[PDB]
Amino acid sequence: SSTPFNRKGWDEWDGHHYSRKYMIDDVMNNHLKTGMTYQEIVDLLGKSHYTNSSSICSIIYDIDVEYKLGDIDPYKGKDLLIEFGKDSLVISYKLIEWESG
Amino acid sequence: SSTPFNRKGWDEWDGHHYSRKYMIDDVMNNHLKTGMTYQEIVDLLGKSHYTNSSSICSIIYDIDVEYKLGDIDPYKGKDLLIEFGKDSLVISYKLIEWESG
Fold this sequence. Notes:
Two copies of one chain form a homodimer. By secondary structure, chain A is α+β, with helices and mostly antiparallel strands. Chain A is built from three helices and four strands, in the order αααββββ.
């Protein structure tokens, strides 16, 4: 199932952001462009899950997370990686699939 | 190949931290324990690649990164995820394998 991005659904949270997996395709195809500013990204998607701040700037939005029944922690998921270059402009963005254990 | 952790090798950098993949097993088996403080982790491993700061605190060390010949960006890698709970104590740590595209 694939649905258009909306910010309410993007923001919905219960343990994880459980509606983002439905709109990631629209986000990447139809909303993300190289050349957007950091501020534009934050305006669109809100605050990221990870950052490399604290000279490429890099942020990560959780997209999907999957659990085994009875496990506190998840064994796989999907992330959205957005990288910024000069003038705080988007230089790349990609979907990351990860697994643990 | 698997070698003991040393901090010089852990720190070595050329594009990525290219010696960490050899010592990650020793790090997880023999140096990481739940209950260590945030400060102890930073003393051992230095500064992480990602953080969720900027109430679980979460940090990520790049362990390994792989590239296709002629590609600016990598298509897969390995990360070390360390999660902190109360009193800034380690509550879990795991190896993350990721891929893109």
